[PDB]
Amino acid sequence: AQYEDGKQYTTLEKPVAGAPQVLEFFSFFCPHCYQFEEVLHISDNVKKKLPEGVKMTKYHVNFMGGDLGKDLTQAWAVAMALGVEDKVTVPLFEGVQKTQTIRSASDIRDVFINAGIKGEEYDAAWNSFVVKSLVAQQEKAAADVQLRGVPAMFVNGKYQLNPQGMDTSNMDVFVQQYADTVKYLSEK
């Protein structure tokens, strides 16, 4: 009643097994995504509503931005492999959509160095298999769920969260509603 399949979430017709707990696809080029992270703080709020044990996962997509899009996906892999995701996210959104300093593969690297990673660590990580695998892993995940647009978040690999069927009025009300539905979906 409170959460029906079709209002606040749509049950995937052809569910994907082996998928992570809570998956969230995004792109540094996607403007709505900036609103999701920087303004709404969706990623850190949903995390503060998820039950103990469950873990969130973010993947970058390459159908937006051209070759540099693919580089940002690979750049995102490096962010995951090194586990510095909780620091490079903002300056990458700002460097691409706001300041507009990031316009090639070199500027992205420059962001990481200023962030706190050695210039040798980044480059060595960029050409690492763990990174290539993650780029192939992300691409596959995005292809399985037949992703068409970002942002987007899936649960249990069998439930796609619909932001359409939720409160749009109070920005704070949509946040909690978006997080609550994730809590329920996680338990089910």
HEC string of 66-105 equals CHHHHHHHHHHHHHHHCCCHHHHHHHHHHHHHHCCCCCCH
Are residues 37 and 93 in contact, defined by beta-carbon separation less than 8 angstroms? yes
Number of Cβ within a 10 Å radius of residue 108: 26
Q: Nearest to residue 158, comparing CAs of 50, 23, 29? A: 23
Separation CA 58–CA 100 (nearest Å): 23
Q: What is the widest separation between alpha-carbon atoms in the chain?
A: 54
PDB experimental method: X-ray
Q: Which helix (H) or strand (E) holds 58?
A: strand 56-60
Yes or no: say if 10 and 44 are a contact pair by the CB < 8 Å rule. no
**Residue 160: strand pairing partners:** 10, 154
- The answer to whether the beta carbons of residues 151 and 11 sit under 8 Å apart is no
Q: What is the dihedral of CA 93, 156, 183, 148, to 10 degrees?
A: 40
Q: Where are the alpha helices (DSSP H) in the chain?
A: 31-34, 42-46, 67-81, 85-93, 105-115, 119-126, 129-144, 171-187
Residues across the chain? 188
Long-range Cβ contact pairs of 159-164 (< 8 A, separation 24 or more): 159/9, 159/10, 159/11, 159/12, 159/185, 159/188, 160/9, 160/10, 160/11, 160/12, 161/8, 161/9, 161/185, 162/7, 162/8, 162/9, 162/10
State how far the Cα of 59 lies from the Cα of 71, in Å rounded to an integer. Answer: 13
Q: How many other CB atoms are found less than 10 A from the CB of residue 140?
A: 12
> Does residue 163 have a cis peptide bond before it, meaning omega lies within 30 degrees of 0?
no
113 vs 22: CA distance, rounded Å: 30
CA–CA distance, 90 with 94 (Å, rounded to integer): 6
The domains found in the chain, sorted by start residue, are 1-188 (3.40.30.10)
